[PDB]
């Protein structure tokens, strides 16, 4: 499992500055994780003011934004709690206004493509869909079942890789 | 009933770490609010310097 | 209420840049209009005590 001692020390070193379970005053803070889990709290928010902890194409180094073991440990610490083609079409209908055209509703320049998503993978997309995003409503439980979330994530991933 | 100061959420004071809500209690809040409101007014009257903290 | 402006920024959805400019402009303007809305309040409370004496 993820080491919660590492998770606490990582929270203190890198996130305490804007988050004491509260949110950063400057701009808009990320805020307390809703339905905290590795799938969504793990998935980064490079878009917007928040900095990108995980760096794409990064070899092991002393200076790094985040550590795979460090990420999991912090996502866990914050989370205390105390037909692929058919899926893609459904995602376009629900998110057809913004996802459709692979573009971004908030910014025309911003896109759902891998360059825009950096080090993207199916798990990172699934996770942001589940609880959605800072400016996007969460989809799990509330709107879409797990098969539907899995299928829409796969469709977005295949469309962006190709 | 009401929790007041959880010192176990944020850990020990290490100078590398950071806390996004660094605020005093309400009797000392007007001192922290006074530092935020004065604008960045420094002097440099000589080779020495006079910081913003003289105005507090 | 300017020392906790980062909590006013997150929860009340205002800004983090504009909560000092409503403080630094407000530090001169707001204590100038609380003088006028309390000097003309305390005198109008006196006139309410003379209507209960003249008329009843």
């Amino acid at each position: 499992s993820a080491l919660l001692r590492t998770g606490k020390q990582l929270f203190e070193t890198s996130c305490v500055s804007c988050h004491g379970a509260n949110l950063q005053g400057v701009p808009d803070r990320g805020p307390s994780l809703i339905g905290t889990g590795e799938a969504a709290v793990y998935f980064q928010v490079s878009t917007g003011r928040m900095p990108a902890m995980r760096g794409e194409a990064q070899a092991p180094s002393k200076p790094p934004h985040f550590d795979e073991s460090q990420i999991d440990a912090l996502g866990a610490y914050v989370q205390a709690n105390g037909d692929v083609a058919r899926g893609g079409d459904l995602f376009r209908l629900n998110c057809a206004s913004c996802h459709n055209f692979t573009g971004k509703g908030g910014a025309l320049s911003s896109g759902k493509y891998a360059p825009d998503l950096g080090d993207a993978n199916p798990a990172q997309i699934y996770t942001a869909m589940l609880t959605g995003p800072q400016n996007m409503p969460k989809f799990s439980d509330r709107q879409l079942t797990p098969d539907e979330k899995r299928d829409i994530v796969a469709y977005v991933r295949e469309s962006a890789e190709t | 009933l009401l929790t007041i100061n959880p010192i176990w959420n944020l850990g020990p004071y290490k100078p590398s770490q950071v806390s996004a809500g660094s605020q005093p209690d309400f009797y000392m809040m007007w001192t922290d609010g006074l530092i935020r409101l004065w604008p960045a007014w420094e002097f440099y009257p000589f080779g020495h310097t006079i910081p913003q903290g003289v105005w507090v | 209420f300017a020392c906790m402006n980062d909590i006013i920024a997150l929860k009340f959805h205002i800004s983090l840049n504009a909560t000092t400019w409503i403080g630094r402009i407000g530090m001169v303007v707001l204590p100038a209009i609380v003088y006028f809305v309390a000097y003309r309040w305390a005198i109008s409370l006196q006139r309410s005590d003379r209507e209960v004496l003249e008329h009843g």
Binding site: G20, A21, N22 | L2, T3, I4, N5, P6, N9, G21, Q23, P24, D25, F26, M29 | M4, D6, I7, L10, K11
Partner: peptide, 30 residues
Amino acid sequence: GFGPAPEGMAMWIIGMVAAIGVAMWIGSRA
């Protein structure tokens, strides 16, 4: 926030209200 600010807010509306509201019952008005 969970530090001194919602705790300081909860002082004046719970604690000092139920410490002035008691004194207005023990004391008089004159």
